[PDB]
């Protein structure tokens, strides 16, 4: 329960008390709340105004209306534990999820009384992917390219978001230096981006995602080695509606 309380524990492996933590607004809490392996009690998730990365391993939860996994309303909970190496062995307890930005994948991969409509109201997780092509590296800058993804409505896509951050080890999570790239023109030159000066002989993790209105696709994380949006969305929707109205008025069927 911090806004300190969990700092006095630090080096603890067995927890005999309930969790009523209410931290709200990851790196700062990793130093202290990053050495938890066994929990014997009640776990509750309060308001968290990014990801539940505090429990690095969480090998075993003892547990003991008999609820052990409670999640309340959140304002910044977009993701969850990495479901590639982390393992959960919760035996005694139930499941209860409130988490509006929690995508459907985190719920479907759980198998590795809960409301369905309320959970994941705005699931901003992409299903498709864009494989990287034409990868060229230099001593100072790296140029990348990707295949163009065109939705049925070409005006829906507002551009591209590019993510990049230094990562000496091959373990990067989406949880920055995001750069916006304007959408290309329909024709067929493949979209691409050239970066600025970077540290030589440093591993870099790069992945690109697309932004669309009320769809889209995101590219997988790739590793390389060297040697106010609401107003814009409203304006785009207004322009699209005006164009549709003009097309309907001008074009009349027989």
């Amino acid at each position: 329960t911090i806004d300190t309380s969990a700092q006095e524990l630090r080096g603890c492996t067995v927890i005999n008390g309930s969790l009523i933590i209410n931290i709200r607004g990851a790196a700062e809490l990793e130093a202290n709340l990053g050495l938890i392996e066994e929990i014997s009690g009640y776990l509750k998730i309060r308001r968290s105004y990014v990801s539940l990365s505090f429990f690095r391993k969480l090998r075993l939860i003892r547990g003991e209306g008999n609820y052990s996994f409670y999640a309340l309303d959140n304002q910044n909970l977009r993701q969850l534990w990495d479901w590639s190496k982390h393992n959960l062995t919760i035996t005694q307890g139930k499941l209860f999820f409130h988490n509006p930005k929690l995508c459907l994948s985190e719920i479907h991969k759980m198998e590795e009384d809960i409301a369905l409509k309320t959970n994941g109201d705005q699931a901003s997780c992409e299903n498709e992917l864009l494989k990287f092509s034409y990868i060229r590296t230099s001593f100072d800058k790296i140029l990348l390219r990707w295949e163009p993804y065109w939705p049925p409505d070409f005006r829906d896509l507002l551009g591209f978001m590019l993510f990049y951050k230094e990562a000496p080890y091959q373990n990067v999570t989406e949880f920055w230096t995001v750069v916006d790239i304007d959408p290309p023109l329909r024709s067929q030159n493949h979209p691409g981006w050239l970066m600025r000066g970077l540290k030589p002989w440093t591993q870099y993790a790069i992945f690109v995602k697309t932004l669309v209105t009320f769809y889209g696709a995101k590219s997988d994380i790739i590793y390389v080695q060297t040697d106010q949006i609401l107003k814009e969305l409203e304006e785009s929707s207004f322009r699209k509606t005006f164009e549709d109205y003009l097309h309907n008025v001008v074009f009349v069927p027989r």
Binding site: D153, R155, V252, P253, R254
Partner: protein
Amino acid sequence: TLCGAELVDALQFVCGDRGFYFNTGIVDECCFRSCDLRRLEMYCAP
């Protein structure tokens, strides 16, 4: 599925020189769904 200015451009491929008619919508039938040449044929003046 054709939307935007190119949607008008395809019309120039269809009519060519026949013009356009003088006197729901085209977007809901061609942009929001799939339409063929027969569906949008009569949009040009006879």
